[model samples]
Target chain A: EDPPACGSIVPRREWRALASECRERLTRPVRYVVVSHTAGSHCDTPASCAQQAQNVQSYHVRNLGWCDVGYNFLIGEDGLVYEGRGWNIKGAHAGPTWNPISIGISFMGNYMNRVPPPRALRAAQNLLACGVALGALRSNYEVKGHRDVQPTLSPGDRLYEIIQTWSHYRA
Target chain B: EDPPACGSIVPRREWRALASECRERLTRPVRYVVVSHTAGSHCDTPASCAQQAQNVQSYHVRNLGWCDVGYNFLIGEDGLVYEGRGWNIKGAHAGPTWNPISIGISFMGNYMNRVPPPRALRAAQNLLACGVALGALRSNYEVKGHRDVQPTLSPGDRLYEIIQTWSHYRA
Candidate 1:
């Protein structure tokens, strides 16, 4: 039988996605995964996370006039993965160069001063593994902090520090 | 003067994109337009057409194991242009030889015996004009039916005949 894919992810329906859109496609077996933080509020329950997800999308769509929420996936302090753009389409979180080549997963809250719960980190890592298993990402994919690719304080200092220790992380 | 960009393409969000992934970047100013047909169900309204777009992506990503929808753009009988892979990324519509060098514009639903509405055809042409204006395609680009390059009945018999009469068509 085929291996389990990214089935663990919470689908867009579960989170009540507002109509999202992106025209560009990211090549499969994506080689890079960039981590980020919302730099906004944090949610610790499923209900709250869903609201936060809607809020982030509304800001990108209603205010920024972006195609959709920028990130491909959002990991909440609730320890669950909130669907953003998902695994296929190109995300707007990072710059053009990195956005096309990488998967952008943002934590639901700022991590500059505080770290996300262990469950949240685990969900993010597992999502990467699922991406690899489903051929959405290459096995040798490298993980980077958003700051690593762009000149921004994203993925937060604390979370960035923790991700640096992961086996797939790159400078 | 640049032609107005592809007219009213349904954003990826409106169509409900799955997290499918894709890679393979084509160089700018692509020189070919390879037309095709979904060869399946058809839709004639924004609501139904949007659902059709989502269903197509799901088949590619979930069932076929493809990264995302194969076409760069999808046309609906409702006289609307639906965004697929768009301008930058390569599409998997035709075989590898043509996929990297051309834009894939597919009409949703089978067209073997019937022709799409005039609006649908116009939307496809306008999208090509937009491509040239945006510098994503060359001024002297060529158009080919899927059957022209592949051993398949695509863009349907009726639609294929129509495209052949287009000024940009090439053998």
Candidate 2:
């Protein structure tokens, strides 16, 4: 239940996250990490990225009426992780079977035609390491593209390709 | 070059549509009508529905970065059809193969468990008749669910079932 004060991550308050009423928690030390893309807009600077993160949460919360931003965390092109529902909360990203077991981390843009910059990629890697160190993700956790467990084209084609080369990624 | 002045269908300007940059034209007297759903919020009044129509267009234009709303038209529970790219303009709803040959009409809400009101259904039927009268759709135009031509649950289960009962609908 502890959230870290890592330098690479931006906690909810910094991004002006809307209050969430979601109560479901993920069982600690989850086995999988599901990566996705917003398929909306991309941002490069912290200011714009934070706004994009807020826009995403508002769409999910105000428009879709979800409990919060569906991802446990979101990565911005500025190389920072935006705290979403956070590690301990169950996310709504991958549907019933997968949401309870996997931590969802979506990059904040459409990655179908372009790859996220190296800094953004590093941010997600660092966050996963933090999740494992904090005992939120198992040390031996697997990484899966959002499309792998769902019928969506999310996480985008280019980003999915890069995830395949990561050490913990599973087909 | 003829747009209808029918009392039933709402023109794009009436809903305050963003100026569309899409110029691709669906060949007149097109053979298909593909129906879909917004899979988002529903509105029962004219004002709310008009705003919903604007929101859909904004998402398509701003988020997806499309020239306009992907569908040729959108139906609302207010018992009205809101014009999108309109009949002559080839819509981006179905894929390239289908877009050029079909007129796409999406209802403005999810319809997996529930169906649109009877009046909303009537509006779509009226639009189809108007399209034919305007030399837009063939007299024997075929009707297909969005799922039939794409790998989506669109036009949803209950609504898809309802369309099957329509006279011109085919597998």
Candidate 3:
């Protein structure tokens, strides 16, 4: 199965740069760039750790192959934006159909770690609102998680808490 | 965590009997009962095999901890409703929140085993229409797959394809 690919410390500036590239290169009109958290497994999460404890960032790094990462951007437990898979290429996130045309931005930590942390959540929420501003995604482009598409254990318990938070806020 | 506690098989002829009991017993008004397929773990299933598979029925019988099966009603691969979780009391399916107020009905076998047998799908569609007609479920009760609530693999890769067909028909 295709796992998530990327990290949390990659930097927001880089995320903006890649997102900018995707927007400029768009052949079709894009409306919004959605921001979501993988609350489950990080791309490279270690098998030894309890599944719920393992986060999305760690797992993605292990499974998905990418120079930097596959996501346009990612959010960390610190609630920071990190750059990931540059915008030009298609995202492997979301469900198959939504992936082809939509830009994918993933959050590195599993927010459902128990209770959604306020700091990380604030960061993610701000970033999503900004995504709407960037035009890399559309307001209706849809904010969805890895679970929204193909079923793989991703964006598990914790991170999902945050994504739902973000979705409800934005919706 | 907590599975369903009760079980009753209501005949199609007795949908009213089941609904009345559920309404009388539930402290909260039944918000809605959902329709979904139990997506099996197989990939590239053939249509004929989908119709014959007893895995869904077996799984519900053995694993589900309820008094009987997990679904209030079950549709078989052969396009028939076999007795499953009882319909009178609340269901254990449909997530923790929805279970208390909604009846949970499942289709036996994985229709998405391949493309989902036309007969199997037709049976499910007919059930949904009957559900709407009998007023046991609301027209706007929200038809969804088990996949929609909580993050687990369900409604199968192929069987969900048919949900779109039925949903559109309802629409």
Candidate 4:
């Protein structure tokens, strides 16, 4: 069966993304998806999730001095998929090498000891399907936890275990 | 008393506003102020207020298809001036005609029957002062309740009565 279209994923506009000043584009059909966590607060309602989204962007722009929020997309516990840098843009997730070749999808809270709710997990999986349909991701894409590419612990220990069970997950 | 500067505003980024597609800008030294209410839930804590701000934006954008949150600024019971479209941008609050010439500042809950705490009122007034200081609003700007210009029962009955007693209020 064909994958769903990118419309299933929320647009950056809906999530109130800043300008597209981060002009670096990724190659089409990205081969990898790097999963990470914001390591911040978790939100389960649309209200709180939106706030969390804003807080993440504020940190990236105000504190880190990045042009925009680093992730390509952010999954909220509210069961919504929020657009970040989006499909064609390169994200500042993972290290330099992985960032260019992969799409970074981060869950919007720490998961070191906790697992994201089922809805958030479902949203992430659905997003990958949409990515493939849009031709932004390779059909045979591999999912790697943040810890897989970098020396630091990310994507959280609990989340890492859950993604390992995903069909697209790679060691 | 000296008004606070515009820097006191909880910026759009801080509140997690979706990337704004609002193109119209209000001319500087705006002549009017319109106060309204969400007519929904009230929040007293920072966490809840953040969530309320998100819910408001989600309603305006996802439900109403507004370019962004309707108001230029939102006041929380938590006593913070959350940034909406802000002073320079035209807002969706009030009607189209007033929107161009006025600043829309909304209290984040129903105040028809109950008054918002003193801090919320203080924050709103402080915001107006900041607008004047920044030259975004005229020092002699007119303040109007939502009910005064529109046929709707907004700004709530009790709050509307309260604003009428302020020095800047106009018939």
Candidate 5:
């Protein structure tokens, strides 16, 4: 019942290798982007998120239509990053409509109704910067929280505010 | 009850119009971009969503903690649009983090479990085009369903698929 956590790095070069795993996969460009949380920032301290992530060997991804964790990428408050659904595969982070054209990225904290730790926000931003650098999204792509499309507040208030202030989040 | 049927026109010059409107009303920059359903295609159908929209307008919206509706613009299957929350204030859409940097836009349909009608999709597209043209979102902004951010099945599979196929829903 705990949210899925990140385990290891899919380094930038490895990320590219994953994207190029197949021509069709590489050719299928990433479109819309999405974010989500576990409904609360379970990480009281910055270390908690990474600590939790390190405990996991691998997590299940739901958007891939499985009963597992969902996300193409995951970020931890400790500034560690992990690969989730991996590249090329459409993510289940956002809703069904958005999944086809989106690359799902999540921070390990919930911000829909709760505020996330600043450390988590920084990690999320760094991840997004990587997303941009990797051409997953346009430099000016609109970064949004999950509640923007759904009805519940998952990311929490604190994290949401920071995301709004962050340079990357635009309409 | 029937879904409220309304239409919005694509202003000839949408960017200036949005900028001018923002300059006049919101004290903060137009940050988050969100859209809501007035009524259209869903697992429930346009007629059903319309009725739900009307019946839930006062009470449901009140629960959402908004002065009025949560969405800014509402799209209908008939290609009509209705104004939801007024433009001057912030929208209740986009959850907490993204609200400041987003403009919430909604379609009048329940896309989570179904797809909007073509007419409805066209209508929503026009609305999206206007928003993008006006700089509400970056040209490569993410067009997503409410579920992308939360744990809901709204903006259903069929409709969401169509949204992903939108000409503008790109990498």
Candidate 6:
């Protein structure tokens, strides 16, 4: 309800989230942050990225029968971070072992051949810092590429390489 | 809808369960089962246990704001196992870390001082067997006492001791 204290991020209500049926919550301060990519088209404007976030949520809810979008948050080239399940809820993006222990932040497009624009990276970085500020994440939390834990090639080559260079990135 | 062939257990409708709002599902075959105790009153007769089960569900729904009763299945001293969320839906027992990957079976009363009747234990065992038979649980699934995984002393002292001797019990 607080939309957290991260002033720049978009709240679920702003994006018109369907009422989430997810009941499980992560026990914070969580120790890990997992980065992923949607492997879909990208949007570089606020209005377009907002719609893209809704589309992603619809697929997970209507097609996969998920309570909500799988990630804790979604980052856009608009430099906006859109709330998904958010930091308090256990997300469905990772396998069960990791979902309850980590915050999953997915970029809204494929990054195998290209990296997200700098603003998008900054939005995610700000969100991670906000997570620590809100005490949702531990001060020494580690960052991991989705591919590092799961068997997929998510947060793909270009983005994956970039995340490995971030301060908290761990094997 | 197929109801997992665990025929002897009571169905939600039979127990007069409030319609469940839960949608998230556990990925089967789940590899763990957690045993717990309600830390409340006990019932040794079907009629009374049925009411106790309903009471428990009411508390979880009304008080905790949970989607349904916390356990996947609730066992009564009458030796009848009552359905809560069942095997398919993820339960709220044990905590987020274990809930999505495990079946939670809670005895309907505290076991701090005494063991449940053998009939109650057998009902839980049969439910475990049914879970494996339905391919909802792994053949080599591990069993954990509630206290073993969470901080609280649940499944209580006596019950905790007994589960440790179970063939699948693991530290």
Candidate with top TM-score is 2
Estimate the lDDT of model 2.
Answer: 0.86
Tens-digit lDDT string for candidate 3 (B1-171)? 334422222353332212212222333334465665554333223343333233443333343222333466666555555444443466555544566677666655444356555665665566555655544556666565565543333566566666645543221
TM-score of the first chain alone, every candidate? 0.96, 0.95, 0.57, 0.93, 0.66, 0.96
| Chain B, per-candidate TM-score | 0.95, 0.95, 0.62, 0.95, 0.63, 0.96
Output DockQ, candidate 3: 0.03
lDDT of 5 by residue, A1-171 (tens): 333333345453432322212122322446456776654235444356544443221223223224334566767656666676555666555554566677667766545455555665666666666665665567676767665544444455566666667565664
By summed lDDT, the worst window of 10 consecutive residues in model 5 chain A runs over A17-26
By DockQ, is 1 or 3 better? 3
Clashing pairs in 4: A15-B18, A16-B18, A16-B19, A17-B19, A54-B16
Per-residue CA lDDT of model 6 for B27-96, tens digit only, reads 9999999999986789999889999989888877875566888889999999999999998999988766
lDDT of 2 by residue, A28-135 (tens): 989999998986779999999999999988877875557788889999999889999998999877766688899999999989789999999999999999888888
Per-residue alpha-carbon lDDT of model 2 for B1-171, expressed as tens digits? 456644377888899999989998989989999999987779999999999999888877775557788889999999998988987898877765688999999899989789999999999998998888887889999999976765446787899999999899988
| Candidate 3: docking tier | incorrect
Select the stronger candidate by lDDT from 1 and 6: 6
Candidate 5 whole-model C-alpha lDDT, 0 to 1: 0.51
Candidate 2, superposed: residue stretches over 4 Å from native: A1-7, B1-171
Ten-residue region with minimum lDDT total, candidate 6 chain A: A147-156
Off by over 4 Å in 5: A1-29, A44-68, A112-114, B1-171
TM-score of chain A of 6: 0.96
Using Cα atoms with residue i matched to residue i, what is each candidate's TM-score against the true structure?
0.50, 0.53, 0.40, 0.50, 0.41, 0.51
Model 1 spans with C-alpha error above 4 angstroms: B1-171
Per-candidate iRMS values, in order, are 21.0, 13.3, 12.1, 19.2, 9.0, 18.4
Give the alpha carbon lDDT tens digit for every residue of B1-171 in model 4.
332233235567656778888999898889999999999899875557878998999999999999999999998886557888887789999997799899999999999789997657766886776577678889888999998889888989999988988888998
**Which window of 10 residues has the lowest lDDT sum in candidate 3 chain A?**
A45-54
Full ranking by TM-score: 2, 6, 1, 4, 5, 3
How high is the lDDT of residue B48 in model 4? Answer: 77
Residue-level lDDT of model 6, residues A30-135, one tens digit each, is 9999999986689999899999999888877875567888889999999999999998999987675789899999999988789999989999999998999899
Select the stronger candidate by TM-score from 4 and 6. Answer: 6
Candidate 4 docking classification: incorrect
Cα deviation in Å at residue A67, candidate 2? Answer: 1.4
Task: Tell me the lDDT of model 3 at B98.
Answer: 63
